[PDB]
Amino acid sequence: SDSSRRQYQEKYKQVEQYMSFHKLPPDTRQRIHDYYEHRYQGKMFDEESILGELSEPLREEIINFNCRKLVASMPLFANADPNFVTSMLTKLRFEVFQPGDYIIREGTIGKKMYFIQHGVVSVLTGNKETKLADGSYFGEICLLTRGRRTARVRADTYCRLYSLSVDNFNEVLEEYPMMRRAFETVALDRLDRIGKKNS
Amino acid sequence: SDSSRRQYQEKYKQVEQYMSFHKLPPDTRQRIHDYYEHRYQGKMFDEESILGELSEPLREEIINFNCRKLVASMPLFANADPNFVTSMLTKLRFEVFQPGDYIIREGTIGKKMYFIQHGVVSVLTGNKETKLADGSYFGEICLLTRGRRTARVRADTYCRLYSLSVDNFNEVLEEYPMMRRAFETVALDRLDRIGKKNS
Amino acid sequence: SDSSRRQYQEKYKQVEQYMSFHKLPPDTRQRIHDYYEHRYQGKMFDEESILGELSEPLREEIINFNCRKLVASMPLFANADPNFVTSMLTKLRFEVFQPGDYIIREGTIGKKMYFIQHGVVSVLTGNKETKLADGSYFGEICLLTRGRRTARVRADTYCRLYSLSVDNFNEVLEEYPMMRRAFETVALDRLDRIGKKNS
Amino acid sequence: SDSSRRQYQEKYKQVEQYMSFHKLPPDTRQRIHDYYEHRYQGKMFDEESILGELSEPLREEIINFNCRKLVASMPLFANADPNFVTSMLTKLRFEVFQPGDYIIREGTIGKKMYFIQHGVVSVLTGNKETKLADGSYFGEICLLTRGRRTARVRADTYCRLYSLSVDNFNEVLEEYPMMRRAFETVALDRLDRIGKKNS
Ligand SMILES: Nc1ncnc2c1ncn2[C@@H]1O[C@@H]2COP(=O)(O)O[C@H]2[C@H]1O
Ligand SMILES: Nc1ncnc2c1ncn2[C@@H]1O[C@@H]2COP(=O)(O)O[C@H]2[C@H]1O
Numbered sequence: 001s002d003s004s005r006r007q008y009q010e011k012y013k014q015v016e017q018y019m020s021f022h023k024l025p026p027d028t029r030q031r032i033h034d035y036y037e038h039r040y041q042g043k044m045f046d047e048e049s050i051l052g053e054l055s056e057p058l059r060e061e062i063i064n065f066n067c068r069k070l071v072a073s074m075p076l077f078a079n080a081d082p083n084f085v086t087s088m089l090t091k092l093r094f095e096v097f098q099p100g101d102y103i104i105r106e107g108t109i110g111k112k113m114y115f116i117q118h119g120v121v122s123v124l125t126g127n128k129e130t131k132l133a134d135g136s137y138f139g140e141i142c143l144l145t146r147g148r149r150t151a152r153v154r155a156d157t158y159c160r161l162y163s164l165s166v167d168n169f170n171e172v173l174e175e176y177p178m179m180r181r182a183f184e185t186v187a188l189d190r191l192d193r194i195g196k197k198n199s
Numbered sequence: 200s201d202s203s204r205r206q207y208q209e210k211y212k213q214v215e216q217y218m219s220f221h222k223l224p225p226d227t228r229q230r231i232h233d234y235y236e237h238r239y240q241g242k243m244f245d246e247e248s249i250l251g252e253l254s255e256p257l258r259e260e261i262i263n264f265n266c267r268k269l270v271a272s273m274p275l276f277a278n279a280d281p282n283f284v285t286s287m288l289t290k291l292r293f294e295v296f297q298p299g300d301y302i303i304r305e306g307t308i309g310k311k312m313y314f315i316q317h318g319v320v321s322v323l324t325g326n327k328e329t330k331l332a333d334g335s336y337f338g339e340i341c342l343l344t345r346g347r348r349t350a351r352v353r354a355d356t357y358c359r360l361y362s363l364s365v366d367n368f369n370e371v372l373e374e375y376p377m378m379r380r381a382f383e384t385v386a387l388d389r390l391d392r393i394g395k396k397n398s
Numbered sequence: 399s400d401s402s403r404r405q406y407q408e409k410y411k412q413v414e415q416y417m418s419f420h421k422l423p424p425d426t427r428q429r430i431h432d433y434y435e436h437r438y439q440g441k442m443f444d445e446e447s448i449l450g451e452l453s454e455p456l457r458e459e460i461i462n463f464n465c466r467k468l469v470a471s472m473p474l475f476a477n478a479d480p481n482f483v484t485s486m487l488t489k490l491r492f493e494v495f496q497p498g499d500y501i502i503r504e505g506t507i508g509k510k511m512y513f514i515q516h517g518v519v520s521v522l523t524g525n526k527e528t529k530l531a532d533g534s535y536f537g538e539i540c541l542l543t544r545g546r547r548t549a550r551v552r553a554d555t556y557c558r559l560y561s562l563s564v565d566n567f568n569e570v571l572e573e574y575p576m577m578r579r580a581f582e583t584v585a586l587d588r589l590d591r592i593g594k595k596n597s
Numbered sequence: 598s599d600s601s602r603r604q605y606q607e608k609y610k611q612v613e614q615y616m617s618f619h620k621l622p623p624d625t626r627q628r629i630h631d632y633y634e635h636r637y638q639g640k641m642f643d644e645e646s647i648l649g650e651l652s653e654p655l656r657e658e659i660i661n662f663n664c665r666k667l668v669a670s671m672p673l674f675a676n677a678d679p680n681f682v683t684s685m686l687t688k689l690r691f692e693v694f695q696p697g698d699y700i701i702r703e704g705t706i707g708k709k710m711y712f713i714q715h716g717v718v719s720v721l722t723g724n725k726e727t728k729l730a731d732g733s734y735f736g737e738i739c740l741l742t743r744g745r746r747t748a749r750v751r752a753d754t755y756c757r758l759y760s761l762s763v764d765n766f767n768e769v770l771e772e773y774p775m776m777r778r779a780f781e782t783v784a785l786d787r788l789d790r791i792g793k794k795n796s
């Protein structure tokens with residue numbers, strides 16, 4: 001049924017006047033148009049408000065239902081205690097990225113990581129371009145090491161991701177330490193496909 | 200009179216489209232329906248906004264009036280200095296739970312506790328299932344010990360609870376230290392109905 | 399002109415249904431009615447939003463204009479550098495209190511102080527009841543000492559006050575240290591009208 | 598197109614009643630009128646909300662487009678790595694100031710700095726009045742030194758500025774340390790046009 005469509009139309013209308021007030025380039029206006037399309041597919045809800053009204057058991061049932069493909073396609077999540085998984089899902093924040101974008105720049109102090117729900121990113125360490133898709137993640141190396149982004153990451157398609165901050169990362173992993181090593185293992189393989197490591 | 204009914208109808212309508220957009224299972228949609236029913240009984244107010252407009256003396260008169268049964272049915276509150284009580288009420292946050300739910304999982308790092316206003320929960324330490332109802336609380340052991348949930352707690356009925364975080368717990372108890380021992384006593388009896396203690 | 403009257407009528411209407419939903423006593427409902435009357439005199443504005451849109455130079459011109467009587471009637475403010483004054487005004491938060499109320503309870507850990515704009519409070523240390531009115535303040539002793547409220551303070555009339563937290567208090571006084579001693583002097587006179595002091 | 602004009606008209610209407618309720622002087626009411634004129638030029642958008650809906654890559658494309666003249670006219674920004682620049686833009690907060698105003702007072706503990714986008718400020722250290730315009734900044738000395746404003750800064754025209762807090766300043770400069778010295782160099786020249794320095 002249509003009604004949260006109008007808040008979208010109503011909001012995006014506001015965006016349109018915002019763009020026009022700032023006399024933005026056309027490529028920008030287009031890009032902004034298409035992003036909204038991809039991020040909201042036409043409706044808009046107070047998801048934050050809706051969620052807040054609910055209880056934890058429900059919110060978890062929702063995020064869990066919504067990330068069934070995320071969870072099944074990702075070994076680290078799929079072969080994990082669904083309680084650790086839940087607690088991690090519950091902290092991801094959804095984000096959309098368009099082709100060309102820079103999700104992560106090299107040299108930058110990294111304070112978050114990403115779970116590719118859907119799309120293809122390009123990783124360029126520079127050495128060779130390694131590629132990652134649905135069921136993968138990246139940017140965990142700054143969360144472990146608290147240093148600089150050991151490469152660049154660039155979206156090739158309309159990515160749909162989930163972000164996790166170092167805060168939440170370290171929280172979930174203090175509660176479920178066994179799982180720190182999973183992320184550790186992966187990070188090393190990658191540091192050794194570069195030529196580095198931490199201590 | 201009817202008018203805050205509409206914000207409820209208006210909000211829940213939004214929930215309905217939110218659920219449908221996410222193509223949620225029917226058991227979930229039902230569960231979500233019934234929760235709202237139990238948490239809002241049909242109206243919705245900016246209680247947070249209303250409260251903020253008021254002063255402390257009033258807000259306290261309200262929460263106090265509203266928790267008359269909570270306070271009378273609970274020795275620890277009832278035989279306590281109503282000033283300590285007030286200051287504790289004023290920090291509880293209301294929460295509803297449905298049958299089956301997991302209020303508390305074992306092994307999890309605990310950062311809050313609960314005051315059963317109304318309903319029956321099941322405690323499973325696993326050893327025997329101990330039961331708790333109106334006029335009881337639980338989950339105080341992680342607040343005292345800052346370790347892991349020493350059992351599991353599962354709602355049997357539509358519970359109506361009040362939650363207290365460790366922050367607020369420790370604040371109220373620094374102002375009124377005599378009362379730390381009450382919660383202490385209870386926690387031990389329970390640790391000794393298990394087989395543990397802290398230091 | 400009338401339009402922010404309606405938000406008041408609209409809000410208070412909500413309060414009315416809130417009160418009725420919670421089946422509050424009549425004395426309470428009356429008290430709540432009269433408070434609103436005294437705190438909003440019938441209109442309601444997004445003062446926080448309005449203010450945020452403004453700049454610092456304006457907000458200060460406003461609070462300054464609005465506290466002309468507060469500032470003139472209070473030696474400590476009136477004989478002070480209007481720059482220190484401004485910076486203090488800018489941090490007060492307006493509060494209304496009704497007759498009978500307990501602004502401050504003895505024994506309680508104190509985290510804020512008050513500037514009587516208008517009304518009469520009663521101070522009971524217990525020894526004798528000392529009285530304070532417009533152009534006075536109180537509750538500065540816990541801000542200096544970080545201990546317990548050295549008395550009780552009870553409104554006799556519909557008080558209109560401004561509150562200052564210890565945070566802001568200590569901030570404004572680190573920028574303008576000369577002024578710490580003013581509040582210090584006053585606090586001692588009062589501790590010696592009791593029988594105490596700090597160190 | 599007109600629609601965010603109404604929120605402006607609707608908001609400013611509220612301001613008008615706010616001013617009248619507080620019986621503000623006419624010079625103030627005028628001043629407040631003209632400020633709004635200069636800060637919103639007639640429309641109002643949820644820029645914060647709009648921005649939040651967007652992604653980082655877009656927000657940056659916007660702020661970057663909007664600060665083209667800011668960036669080109671300011672050596673420190675223009676001859677800098679546009680990545681450091683971006684990350685700094687992204688943290689500025691827009692502010693408008695009217696003639697006469699005190700942007701910065703001497704002796705005050707300084708917790709932020711300014712980038713003159715457009716307008717002329719007057720600096721009075723007191724020694725001689727030095728002047729600064731578009732493509733300049735000031736108030737960086739307290740950010741480096743964490744002491745007191747080494748002068749006074751007063752707007753001569755309707756200034757349009759961008760503010761940067763010490764927090765964000767020190768964050769951006771920990772990520773891009775080479776750039777600390779730029780701001781350092783400038784600060785010294787200025788301390789030596791006074792007669793001071795830090796250690
Ligand atoms: N060889 C690789 N294969 C896959 N992913 C990589 C490789 N090298 C780096 N990454 C990811 O790219 C990210 C770049 O930023 P981070 O250092 O935060 O974390 C890095 C890894 O998560
Ligand atoms: N034998 C028991 N009887 C009643 N309550 C208990 C018992 N054992 C544990 N609990 C409660 O169950 C809670 C489980 O989580 P906590 O460790 O936070 O705190 C525990 C107690 O509050």
Ligand SMILES: Nc1ncnc2c1ncn2[C@@H]1O[C@@H]2COP(=O)(O)O[C@H]2[C@H]1O
Nearest residue numbers: 528536537538539540547548549588591
């Ligand atoms: N003799 C007195 N005369 C006036 N005010 C007092 C006197 N004694 C205490 N007070 C005020 O009453 C306040 C009670 O709380 P505080 O200790 O925070 O600070 C105290 C003083 O500000």
Ligand SMILES: Nc1ncnc2c1ncn2[C@@H]1O[C@@H]2COP(=O)(O)O[C@H]2[C@H]1O
Nearest residue numbers: 727735736737738739746747748787790
């Ligand atoms: N001689 C000068 N020329 C230009 N700007 C100055 C001069 N002296 C001081 N300033 C600026 O004026 C500011 C006053 O506050 P700050 O100490 O924060 O930082 C100071 C400088 O940024």
